DNA sequence: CCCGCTGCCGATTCCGCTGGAACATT
DNA sequence: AATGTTCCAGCGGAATCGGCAGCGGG
């Protein structure tokens, strides 16, 4: 029957970050996200998304408390994308710099999921990230989150930019950094990431991530 | 040539010899060779219903033809087949068609063999059409026409060999005196029985040799080899019914037309335009914007590299394949690059990556050109030409994603006789013929129609299974397999 | 400016294939 | 509603052929 999608895009200042020489992770990420929600709209299937930015100017976030869950504002809830949900990215330059988290517009991806899954059946949930990984990492709670993910029975996946290790353009069947493209930081980040995915399912989560 | 029509005139003979069924009740040879030839007009009429075949009869006693030799009958001047004409012969069938045959113009006579050779060259030579075989079929079974004269034979041989230097090929099927191919005739000078194919070989098939595509393939820059695009297999397909009109039996003449912009009143091909109502709103543009949004390459194929043959698995089809053949009188020397990119890709067993763009505004579409090695031998075994087959490959979509969460194994002793059913089964494949059911008792029907003869034949199915011959040649081991591990439970 | 050939090149007709749109069914 | 069939529409190959230019002579 149907679906629903929760999209979690980072809008962060260092994925937005001025371009090298290349193009900028911010436009790849629209660039992906806009052609999704593109096939979602002119396909005409009965698919909801719901679509949350991380790392943003305000956090318009229905769960904000204290310090965490900031910069974090849920756009849409999950309803039938239109031209709304699609000219919004169009009209969506304002990267908003305050990078705050990500697994923070994980969580609230699933308290919006929770708070979204009733008088409408649903038999898939889906989540997708879109992160430099260039933030200072949230290790309030991962245990649970992961709890929460295998008993919700729901499957995300990340993707993450060019940084994985020519004039790799957009694609190209070839390199995906040019010369050096991670920091130590991103480093962390990819390999907390894996190691969480992993345990998740293993192998073929780390087989769900791409640039 | 390609807009070579193919010609074939049909001499039979009525002397005497083919009105007497030697002493036997099986056949009389002349209703043989009628037998023949209407099993010939209705094979060409759904094969190659633009040829041209003629009726001729000689040795019988009145006469017809341009000419006014004596004992010749033209019964038909070659032209396209048709209803009328089959039925026109039909009317000759069995020893009732055969006494019709007697007092309409009467066998018994003496024939030149000359006259009627001359016959057939007229009417050969009176047709307008590009012509690319003439040929002859004599239906006679006499050995000597010249049982009496040498002068007659003389001036028959040389009739012969004049046709022969026009290229007009006589050929003879002997229709046989006592039943049986003894009688061995002498005329290997005038000639160039096989014969129960031509009763019955093609019930339906079809003619044709042409491009379909002219394209360039280039090597990325300039380097560009004109190369034509065949089609070695089909999927021939009913021809279209015609809109007929019920009181005289008459094409009709659509004209299809819009307008009544609620007023009533033509409209134009320019007053129009092209929308699509996505969700809620409504996106419109024009004609040839809806027709230039898919345009990214000309038309050609364009190396984008080689892969060798074994990583390309050969479930990815989609479209049946073509023929990738050079074609050197666009751009001239492409032969020789297609000969030994060809002998190249053979010996390192590597396909060529292409985007093929078949017309001028069409996505691009990837496509394989798998090297295909010409095989032949002293028979001549011409079955499948040098070049390359241009395998379509599916992009992303184009798969699908299946169930996939079902995985069992069996015990490896059902193999074992799965082994015996399917080697006592192991058959030959073919060479051809299993020819369409829907289409074959299309053409019966409207043979039946055209014809309105009994009542329409009913073709034999050969691809349905013959399952008592399956059952009875398996015999006791499909039971054993049933109930080896797994009854019924109840 | 005429006058005349004469290459030759454009368009038609005839096919045939493909694609897109409409149909009818469980 | 999922699909296969039918139908309609459009493009191209191939052969033909006529006249449109341009090019010499008058």
Redesign the pocket.
Known sequence: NKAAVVLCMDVGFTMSNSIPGIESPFEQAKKVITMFVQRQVFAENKDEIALVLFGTDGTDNPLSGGDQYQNITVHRHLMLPDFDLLEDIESKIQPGSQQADFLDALIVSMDVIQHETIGKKFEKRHIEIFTDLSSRFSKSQLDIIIHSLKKCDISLQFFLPFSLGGPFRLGGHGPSFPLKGITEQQKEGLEIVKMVMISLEGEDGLDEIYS | ????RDSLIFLVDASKAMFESQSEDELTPFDMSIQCIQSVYISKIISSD?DLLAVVFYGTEKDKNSVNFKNIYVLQELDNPGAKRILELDQFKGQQGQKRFQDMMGHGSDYSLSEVLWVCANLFSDVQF?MSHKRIMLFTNEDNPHGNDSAKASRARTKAGDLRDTGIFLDLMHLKKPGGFDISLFYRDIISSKLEDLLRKVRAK???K??????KLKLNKDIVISV?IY?LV?????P??I?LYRETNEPVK?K?RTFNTSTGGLLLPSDTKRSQIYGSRQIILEKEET?EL?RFDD?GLMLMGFKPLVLLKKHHYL??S?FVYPEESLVIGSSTLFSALLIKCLEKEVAALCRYT?????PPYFVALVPQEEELDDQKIQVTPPGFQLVFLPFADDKRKMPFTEKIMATPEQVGKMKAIVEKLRFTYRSDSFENP?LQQHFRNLEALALDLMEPEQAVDLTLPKVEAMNKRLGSLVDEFKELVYPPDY
């Open positions: 040539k390609y807009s070579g633009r590009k079809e003619t044709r042409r491009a379909l595509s002219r394209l034509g089609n089909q999927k021939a397909l009913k279209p019914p809109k659509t299809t027709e898919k038309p479209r049946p073509l078949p017309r001028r505004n069409i829907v």
